[PDB]
Amino acid sequence: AVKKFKPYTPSRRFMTVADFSEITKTEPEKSLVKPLKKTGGRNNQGRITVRFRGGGHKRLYRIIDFKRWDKVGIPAKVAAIEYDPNRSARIALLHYVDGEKRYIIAPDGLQVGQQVVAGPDAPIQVGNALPLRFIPVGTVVHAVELEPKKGAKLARAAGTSAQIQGREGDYVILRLPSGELRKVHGECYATVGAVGNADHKNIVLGKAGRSRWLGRRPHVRGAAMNPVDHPHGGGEGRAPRGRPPASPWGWQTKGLKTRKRRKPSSRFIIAR
Amino acid sequence: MKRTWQPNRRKRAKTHGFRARMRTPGGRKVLKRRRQKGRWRLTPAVRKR
RNA sequence: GUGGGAGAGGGUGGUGGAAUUCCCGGAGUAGCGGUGAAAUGCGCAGAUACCGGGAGGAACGCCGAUGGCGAAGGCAGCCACCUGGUCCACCCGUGACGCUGAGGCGCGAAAGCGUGGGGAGCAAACCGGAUUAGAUACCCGGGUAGUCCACGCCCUAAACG
RNA sequence: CCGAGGGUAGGGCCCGUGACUGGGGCGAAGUCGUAACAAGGUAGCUGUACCGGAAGGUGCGGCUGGA
RNA sequence: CGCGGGGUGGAGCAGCCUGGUAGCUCGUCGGGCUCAUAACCCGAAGGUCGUCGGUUCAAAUCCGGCCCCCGCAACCA
RNA sequence: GUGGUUCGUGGAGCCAUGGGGGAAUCUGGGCGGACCACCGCCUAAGGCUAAGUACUCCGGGUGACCGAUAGCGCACCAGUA
RNA sequence: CGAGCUAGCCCUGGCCAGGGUGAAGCUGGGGUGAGACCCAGUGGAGGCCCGAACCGGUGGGGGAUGCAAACCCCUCGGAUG
RNA sequence: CGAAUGCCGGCAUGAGUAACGAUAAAGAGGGUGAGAAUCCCUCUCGCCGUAAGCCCAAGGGUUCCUACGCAAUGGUCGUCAGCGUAGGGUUAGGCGGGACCUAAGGUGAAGCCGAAAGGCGUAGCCGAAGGGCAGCCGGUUAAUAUUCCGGCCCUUCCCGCAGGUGCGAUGGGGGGACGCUCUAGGCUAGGGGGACCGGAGCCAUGGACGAGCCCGGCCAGAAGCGCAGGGUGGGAGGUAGGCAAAUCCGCCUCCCAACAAGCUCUGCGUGGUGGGGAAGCCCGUACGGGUGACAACCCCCCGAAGCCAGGGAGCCAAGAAAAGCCUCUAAGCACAACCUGCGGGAACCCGUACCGCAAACCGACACAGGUGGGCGGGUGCAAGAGCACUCAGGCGCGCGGGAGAACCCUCGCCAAGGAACUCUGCAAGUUGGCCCCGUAACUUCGGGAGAAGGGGUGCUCCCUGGGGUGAUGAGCCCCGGGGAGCCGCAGUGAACAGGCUCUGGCGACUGUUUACCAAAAACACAGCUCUCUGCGAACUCGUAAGAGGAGGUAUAGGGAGCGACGCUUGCCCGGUGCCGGAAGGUCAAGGGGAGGGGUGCAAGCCCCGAACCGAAGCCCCGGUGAACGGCGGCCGUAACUAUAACGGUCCUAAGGUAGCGAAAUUCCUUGUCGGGUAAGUUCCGACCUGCACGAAAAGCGUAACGACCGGAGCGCUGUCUCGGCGAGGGACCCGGUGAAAUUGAACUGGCCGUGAAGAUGCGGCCUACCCGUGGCAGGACGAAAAGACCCCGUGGAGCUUUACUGCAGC
RNA sequence: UCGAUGUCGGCUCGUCGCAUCCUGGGGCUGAAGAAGGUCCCAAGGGUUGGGCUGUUCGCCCAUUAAAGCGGCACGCGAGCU
Numbered sequence A: 001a002v003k004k005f006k007p008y009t010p011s012r013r014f015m016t017v018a019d020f021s022e023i024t025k026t027e028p029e030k031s032l033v034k035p036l037k038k039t040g041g042r043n044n045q046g047r048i049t050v051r052f053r054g055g056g057h058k059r060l061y062r063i064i065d066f067k068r069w070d071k072v073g074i075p076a077k078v079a080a081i082e083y084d085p086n087r088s089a090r091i092a093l094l095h096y097v098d099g100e101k102r103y104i105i106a107p108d109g110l111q112v113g114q115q116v117v118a119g120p121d122a123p124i125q126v127g128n129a130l131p132l133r134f135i136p137v138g139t140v141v142h143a144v145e146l147e148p149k150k151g152a153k154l155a156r157a158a159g160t161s162a163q164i165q166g167r168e169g170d171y172v173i174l175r176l177p178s179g180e181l182r183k184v185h186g187e188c189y190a191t192v193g194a195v196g197n198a199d200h201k202n203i204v205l206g207k208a209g210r211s212r213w214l215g216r217r218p219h220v221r222g223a224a225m226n227p228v229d230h231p232h233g234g235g236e237g238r239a240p241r242g243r244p245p246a247s248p249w250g251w252q253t254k255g256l257k258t259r260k261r262r263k264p265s266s267r268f269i270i271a272r
Numbered sequence B: 001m002k003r004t005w006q007p008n009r010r011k012r013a014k015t016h017g018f019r020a021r022m023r024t025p026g027g028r029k030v031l032k033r034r035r036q037k038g039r040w041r042l043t044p045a046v047r048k049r
Numbered sequence C: 001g002u003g004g005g006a007g008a009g010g011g012u013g014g015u016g017g018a019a020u021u022c023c024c025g026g027a028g029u030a031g032c033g034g035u036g037a038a039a040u041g042c043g044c045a046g047a048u049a050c051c052g053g054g055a056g057g058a059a060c061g062c063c064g065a066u067g068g069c070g071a072a073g074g075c076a077g078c079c080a081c082c083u084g085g086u087c088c089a090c091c092c093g094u095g096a097c098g099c100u101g102a103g104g105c106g107c108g109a110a111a112g113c114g115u116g117g118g119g120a121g122c123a124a125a126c127c128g129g130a131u132u133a134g135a136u137a138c139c140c141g142g143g144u145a146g147u148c149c150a151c152g153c154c155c156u157a158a159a160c161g
Numbered sequence D: 001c002c003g004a005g006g007g008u009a010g011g012g013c014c015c016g017u018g019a020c021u022g023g024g025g026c027g028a029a030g031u032c033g034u035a036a037c038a039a040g041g042u043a044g045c046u047g048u049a050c051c052g053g054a055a056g057g058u059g060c061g062g063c064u065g066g067a
Numbered sequence E: 001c002g003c004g005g006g007g008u009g010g011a012g013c014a015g016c017c018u019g020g021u022a023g024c025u026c027g028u029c030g031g032g033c034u035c036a037u038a039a040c041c042c043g044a045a046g047g048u049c050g051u052c053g054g055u056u057c058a059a060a061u062c063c064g065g066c067c068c069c070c071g072c073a074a075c076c077a
Numbered sequence F: 001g002u003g004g005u006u007c008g009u010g011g012a013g014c015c016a017u018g019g020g021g022g023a024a025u026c027u028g029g030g031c032g033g034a035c036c037a038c039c040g041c042c043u044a045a046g047g048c049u050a051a052g053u054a055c056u057c058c059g060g061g062u063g064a065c066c067g068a069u070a071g072c073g074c075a076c077c078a079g080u081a
Numbered sequence G: 001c002g003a004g005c006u007a008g009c010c011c012u013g014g015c016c017a018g019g020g021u022g023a024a025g026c027u028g029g030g031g032u033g034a035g036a037c038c039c040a041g042u043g044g045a046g047g048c049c050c051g052a053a054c055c056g057g058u059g060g061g062g063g064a065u066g067c068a069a070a071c072c073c074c075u076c077g078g079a080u081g
Numbered sequence H: 001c002g003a004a005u006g007c008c009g010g011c012a013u014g015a016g017u018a019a020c021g022a023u024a025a026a027g028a029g030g031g032u033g034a035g036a037a038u039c040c041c042u043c044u045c046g047c048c049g050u051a052a053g054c055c056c057a058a059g060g061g062u063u064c065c066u067a068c069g070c071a072a073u074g075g076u077c078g079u080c081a082g083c084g085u086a087g088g089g090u091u092a093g094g095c096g097g098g099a100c101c102u103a104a105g106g107u108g109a110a111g112c113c114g115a116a117a118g119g120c121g122u123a124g125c126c127g128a129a130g131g132g133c134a135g136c137c138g139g140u141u142a143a144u145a146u147u148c149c150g151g152c153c154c155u156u157c158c159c160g161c162a163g164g165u166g167c168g169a170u171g172g173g174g175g176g177a178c179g180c181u182c183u184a185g186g187c188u189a190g191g192g193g194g195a196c197c198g199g200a201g202c203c204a205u206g207g208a209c210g211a212g213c214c215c216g217g218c219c220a221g222a223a224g225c226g227c228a229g230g231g232u233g234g235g236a237g238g239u240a241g242g243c244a245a246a247u248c249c250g251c252c253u254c255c256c257a258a259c260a261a262g263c264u265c266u267g268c269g270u271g272g273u274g275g276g277g278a279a280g281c282c283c284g285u286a287c288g289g290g291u292g293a294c295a296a297c298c299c300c301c302c303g304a305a306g307c308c309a310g311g312g313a314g315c316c317a318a319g320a321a322a323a324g325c326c327u328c329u330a331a332g333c334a335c336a337a338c339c340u341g342c343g344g345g346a347a348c349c350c351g352u353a354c355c356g357c358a359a360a361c362c363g364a365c366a367c368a369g370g371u372g373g374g375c376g377g378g379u380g381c382a383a384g385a386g387c388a389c390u391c392a393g394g395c396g397c398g399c400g401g402g403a404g405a406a407c408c409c410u411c412g413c414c415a416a417g418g419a420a421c422u423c424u425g426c427a428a429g430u431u432g433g434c435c436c437c438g439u440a441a442c443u444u445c446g447g448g449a450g451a452a453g454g455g456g457u458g459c460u461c462c463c464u465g466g467g468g469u470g471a472u473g474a475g476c477c478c479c480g481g482g483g484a485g486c487c488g489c490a491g492u493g494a495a496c497a498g499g500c501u502c503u504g505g506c507g508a509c510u511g512u513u514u515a516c517c518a519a520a521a522a523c524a525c526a527g528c529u530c531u532c533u534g535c536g537a538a539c540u541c542g543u544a545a546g547a548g549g550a551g552g553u554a555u556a557g558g559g560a561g562c563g564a565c566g567c568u569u570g571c572c573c574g575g576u577g578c579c580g581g582a583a584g585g586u587c588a589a590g591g592g593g594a595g596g597g598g599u600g601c602a603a604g605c606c607c608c609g610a611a612c613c614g615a616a617g618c619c620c621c622g623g624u625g626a627a628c629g630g631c632g633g634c635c636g637u638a639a640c641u642a643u644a645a646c647g648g649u650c651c652u653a654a655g656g657u658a659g660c661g662a663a664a665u666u667c668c669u670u671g672u673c674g675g676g677u678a679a680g681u682u683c684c685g686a687c688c689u690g691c692a693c694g695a696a697a698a699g700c701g702u703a704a705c706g707a708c709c710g711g712a713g714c715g716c717u718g719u720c721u722c723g724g725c726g727a728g729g730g731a732c733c734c735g736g737u738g739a740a741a742u743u744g745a746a747c748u749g750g751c752c753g754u755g756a757a758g759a760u761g762c763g764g765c766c767u768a769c770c771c772g773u774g775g776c777a778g779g780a781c782g783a784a785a786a787g788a789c790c791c792c793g794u795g796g797a798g799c800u801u802u803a804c805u806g807c808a809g810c
Numbered sequence I: 001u002c003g004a005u006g007u008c009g010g011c012u013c014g015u016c017g018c019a020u021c022c023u024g025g026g027g028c029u030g031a032a033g034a035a036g037g038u039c040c041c042a043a044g045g046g047u048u049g050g051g052c053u054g055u056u057c058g059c060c061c062a063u064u065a066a067a068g069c070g071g072c073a074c075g076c077g078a079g080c081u
Ligand SMILES: NC[C@@H]1O[C@H](O[C@H]2[C@@H](O)[C@H](O[C@@H]3[C@@H](O)[C@H](N)C[C@H](N)[C@H]3O[C@H]3O[C@H](CO)[C@@H](O)[C@H](O)[C@H]3N)O[C@@H]2CO)[C@H](N)[C@@H](O)[C@@H]1O
Pocket: D027, D030
């Protein structure tokens, strides 16, 4: 989708909005299973650690289910599909037959009315979740766990997905939304299908405000400030850095790798 | 234009208050000295009810 | 209308094997590439050649024809779904309902453009090496757009019988 | 009231003209190269695309007006 | 005015700093191939080293003065 | 690897120690300025211990100390206005 | 010792007269094989417009031992973000 | 002590000088008094009136009210006061806050961390104009009143009775509970009108005894009614979820409802009763009282932004928590308890005066400044909180009186010309609201547009079309149309209200910024690209714990640059960086000990110490430019000259492509052409010899946007030729109060000289009676700041880097 | 002169020198006349308005009897810009 606009105001011409057709007549969220008071704040205890944040629409947290072995075997019916301000993926709310309700990040396909479930059993269909081993090599899938019982963590962004590649001992090779081939443990669930609402990468914010709404204040270039507060700074009419591009704190930012070398997680990785 | 003193009872006891100064090691010393110097008033005289 | 036939006709989903390129393991050395001849290039930091495994893209050998299908552009591994055209027999139905067709509208190879994806091979531009008087060329070693996918454009041709 | 015309303001079409600029035509015997016609010494032509003093080259698909 | 770099056969350039030996490419000239020109092949010629001085046994070379050439600098007022 | 001592890496002991290694109970151990021999001196890895010493919020005494711009900031309801 | 000024952010409240312009979307008609689309009418969008409050502070003049250690007069920017 | 721009103090000079704090404005009569422009009173005048009037909150803290007072405070005066002395004055179960709840954030048992101090920290606790919660209208005081009094109406507790039910928690669930914009229906606040009702009165000056003028025609109010409107399905089975249990909630599955029919729940009317009730006139105030009065207290119309409220619709940026409340059960308990009515009793603490857009708050001041919320009438102007006037109400700004100079400020007008002004149309003018005609290039189809340029606008009469409220009508109120006619110079007749256009530069745009000299072309900005990061992420803060990132997960997060959009962004990887290289070379501690030394009679003890094994880094091999960067010189050549498509050569890592170009870049330079002008160092269009453009420190464009910057024209004008007159506030004179920086002392002239080189002071000459007042600024190298430039000091700071040396960090 | 002598130009206001631009007087002329040339005397008065540039200065445009050169802290900011 992606709503468009006629130019009746510069900016609201290039501006592009999402299409909330996929939003089952829902909107008002569900008390109980979410929401919780969401403590918004751009800095830690005192100081500001991440810069340029703050401001932007008030938000309510939708406490989603990111570990599904909670209900192994208990099937549930997908009730609605709603908007979640805390993420890029739309989320689906679903009523188990157990009578319990919980939200799930909604996969592309999954339609309201559908029945979905989790566990070793589970049929390989959009929405169902199973330990990685039991999933057919090659099938795509989202909401992966990295270590058994620790909760989902990979491919959860709007319309992202990972594809299974092979098996190898108690591990199974994956291919993350980034292109890295990772070795994940067999016992990590991963609900099947891709995340959906993949038009998300196409929304043209539009104006200055639009960014402000999502809580992101203006970002000033180092080049603009002085030597006192950033490498690229001073002296006359602009300047060409004058040294290898660096961050406010001073480490190179055009090429310098960061992953800490001797990490134990190294051996389970294979790509880029 | 607007100036720098905008009186506020709450802020004043809340900041230069007595329990305020007792709470920290530096403030307790603030008291010591003032006590040791004589000062009729150890801390500002906030008021009302 | 009835009952049959052939076909790379069209769209969608899926799938198979050969080969190339890369990665990993093995084993193995002093050269491999390349050309008119060469050089650039690659190779003891272990290349080429050989075996094993894995990844990925694109194109479908034999069948294949001087064959088939389409209005053209064009269409080729295999499977299923949706779908167009068309030939024969039977002479059952309508009953002149026909032909062409300014304009309109649709389709329209390759290259090109937008947005996103993909990128193995190839390859404008570009970089080298030779050739030459010179080479902004032909030849050789690299190589990016593009070539592939989806959606939206562009409307050209020796779009030729 | 209408009304010749005059006034003011803004448009439409056409003609003339202009520093300088673009390509074209024409003009016996100036320069550079050799693209095409013989297999033209890289078959040629082509739509498109990028590049080059120049003819032109190269990519992609195409045509026989070549084999 | 100040600073430092450069003048070498017809053309463009080496050769000096560690003085004695001027080299490269093109061009020029004679011959060859060609029907002829070029390309190409074989042979040959060509430099008071910007000038006036001395330094040495010996100066393109080292050291002073002018002669043009090029490049830089000329700020704070 | 450092701190302490006069000792600033010096021939650098001694006394403390963060790190690593890691004993013995008198024929046991430490020290006398690297080290070794000899000759000697002490007996580490537990603790306490008056007095002699420092100070002056406070009381008292005395001044070749001041005498209201001095002397405490304040002789006076001053850490006040 | 200070964020009772100023800067940013967090939590919780409040304010923005009245005028313009008229987006999507609806509905009707037209169109087609179905569409695209085109007409009206409806609709009430927007860091849209005029303009107070309010937030500013463009130009000029005055003030310059001032009314004022940043003011006054005329003029002017924004004013649903 | 004579100097230190010395320190403390005192008193001079400037000087009766400047001032006396908004140009809203005063005049008189009568009081009081020792003394009145300044205090009280009355009359007249003027100013505010989306306030300069009322009501809260903050802050202040007696300023409140009253009596007696003027030394000081008051910019004058003062009999007055916000001043001095004294006395009085602030009354709550229902207002606000607390014996209620939670927010950010604090604090913090458990726990974690830190040399000490301390730092973190889920529970809990604290924390509020947010949630919850029971009082409305009058009357009284010199001063308090939702507090006292009257009327009417409520809330909790505790104890009884009376009757109902399994009652029962800090535990489960429900609810509370939530955005922005736009909105309907019905109400209310508030306002307009009345031939009706009620009122003292009044006919003036030519007319009017009139459906005349003037004034007023309400307020609260339980239950019950009515009218609006908000909430809500009712059964029954089954259950494995809501961290124990539930009959509750949730999820299934059958029924009857789909309606607000019914239950409740608010709001508004009406309501027993309770109150208020003008002008005017009489009074004595410093003000209130009396009468009007048995006051009347009725009918229309406009109507909210407020009420019903959790109403509705649309949109994306997706919009607190906890308690009260309802329900559910657990322990326990069911002679308890809880629910419902009825009584009786109990109901604490703190605030309460006054100021409150300001003389009581923040600005040293009775300071032209700053200060949050609510009410804010009428008429007219299209509307409105605009503007003009004016209700209620409040003021005339705590020095006056004269004068009628220069000059200044603010204002008004002007013959002829009109930008000649000037750096610049700076300033000022012109234009201006509404309605209707009519509007170009260009363009991202929105725009450009209020383009431009025009016409209309008052009042009177006639005819006539729509609504709204009332019944389908009168009225009352909104919108319209047509035709005659009247008057002035002029009809948005006053006030509020764009001058327009053409063409360049920069930046896309709305925004943002140097609080107090820069608002911009600077920053930001959507968007583009590069790079890091697989999640206990990178990064940041922190010694740590910890947190932010993020309750996010590659369509995500960090960093860098570029900066809408269009067309595009060439070549160089030699040097620097970063990226990739289980080979080499170097390389520290450590391992290793060939060999050597010191002492021992010796076993020994203690030292050095070569091979060799030894990381990262560097070296080295490769890559990489939307990484730091860089992107040539000299000669010759065409059949007129000229120029050079062509060639030679030298050196690079490669030798700037497209596009643009005398530029926000051009030194020479007012380059040379062309355009605008009578005339053009600027401006626009070209050429290219680009001192010294050039492609994400982006390149060249670009509609729209701009308090940005340049050039031009129209319109208009006191900018100007070139001034003139007029207004007011000062200036001046008089009475009252009365500063200042400055100051070696002064009895302080011109000239030509001279002097440390610029003399009132020295020489010579000239001039010159003593002292002021308004004026002008040439001078006293005039005042003001121990020059902000420059240099100096082995002075200081901020900043940089392949300066040195360290440290964090890796 | 740095315990401060405000600095270009413009404006306003002047004033002074003469090595005179004009007007007045004069000599020589290769002075027929008219108009010039050149020098001598002479400062009494006069010595324009515009375009461009911050400009001084210049170059223009239109005129004039002429469109003089200099000084006064590149005269004059307790006079202005
Ligand atoms: N008519 C020819 C048109 O112009 C071009 O041709 C033009 C040029 O290429 C051509 O130039 C030629 C040159 O090619 C050739 N190699 C040398 C010759 N001297 C030149 O000649 C030219 O100049 C000379 C003297 O002035 C004249 O007399 C002659 O007419 C003229 N053609 O002269 C032509 C104009 O006259 C295109 N090549 C051709 O395809 C096109 O159709």
